[PDB]
């Protein structure tokens with residue numbers, strides 16, 4: 001076991017590792033020193049994260065790491081990386097969304113329910129049943145808040161956004177769109193963005209040209225749709241800190257102002273026959289980080305770009321780096 005006491009400002013990278021090989025890891029990058037630290041959860045705690053580290057949220061000095069195929073969320077000190085607690089019993093957890101210190105939602109694959117937890121006591125307290133959904137093909141994924149409502153995309157073998165009333169913990173509406181919306185963000189106009197992966201060739205569920213959608217939160221209606229090419233396998237809508245510039249992965253890294261009527265001809269970062277897989281925008285300074293899985297086998301590489309697309313830095317992370325979590329001392333945005 002190793003003692004860490006890292007920067008007040010930094011960047012976590014979760015590494016999924018290889019599904020069913022239990023080689024998921026956590027990386028910590030200091031943008032001021034341009035130094036990366038790899039395998040920091042193992043190094044700090046003396047045991048493995050597990051299988052498919054999916055996502056991470058930082059709240060009140062604690063990092064909540066979702067380990068999808070280990071049925072657990074780890075709570076860590078964001079400075080020492082030491083575990084302060086864990087929640088077990090998740091079917092196959094995906095994303096955590098906090099409503100309070102005592103209430104959060106945890107989405108699942110292979111379950112038709114969203115888990116309700118108490119992060120304070122580290123307990124599962126209840127379940128939200130998704131309509132028209134079973135265990136065999138169930139999927140809830142990313143979440144955004146809109147007043148008293150949480151919106152959630154249904155990804156694997158699903159084609160819906162659900163609306164949850166957080167005051168009753170019930171799904172109160174749904175919207176059917178293209179198959180397998182991957183990810184969900186809310187822009188500063190309270191308009192949601194989601195991008196579909198289009199399924200895959202030979203899928204028992206579907207295989208189609210994928211789309212990027214803008215969905216008004218108030219009317220819960222599609223306002224814009226940008227359809228791509230059959231065989232495209234897009235992912236990971238991401239916003240800048242002012243929530244007026246959208247990024248996503250579709251071979252290339254794409255950038256579009258949220259009020260645009262057309263996807264720009266030119267991508268932010270050109271495809272280079274690798275596997276762009278993870279994406280984030282520094283919420284304070286607009287710097288763009290691209291996690292490249294390369295070939296899903298070797299150590300991944302993160303590329304750090306200026307908001308104008310000029311390379312700043314590049315560093316190795318773990319295998320299949322999938323997600324980022326910002327550790328910021330101050331947020332410039334409200």
Ligand code: CNC
Nearest residue numbers: 016017018019052068069092156157199200295296297320
């Ligand atoms: C590439 C890939 C990946 N996939 Co697929 C995705 N997205 N996937 C695919 C594709 C594989 C073929 C291709 N076009 O390249 C593709 C699009 C067909 C696919 C399909 C699926 N995938 C699916 C899921 C959910 C997953 N996939 C990942 C394994 C997920 C991977 C991410 C990860 N962290 O592992 C992943 C990004 C990289 C796998 C890889 O090539 N590794 C390198 C390779 C050398 O190692 P490998 O051990 O031989 O990998 C093989 C397996 O991973 C297998 N496989 C891939 N996905 C699954 C899912 C399941 C349930 C099973 C049993 C096997 C697989 O295919 C690979 C090629 O043989 C996953 C961990 C991503 C995630 N972070 O959630 C996740 C499984 C989570 C879980 N707890 O079950 C689908 C259910 C998604 C969907 N509804 O479209 C579906 C299931 C197919 C099935 N039942 O076999």
Ligand SMILES: [Cl-]
Nearest residue numbers: 026039041042
């Ligand atoms: Cl680790």
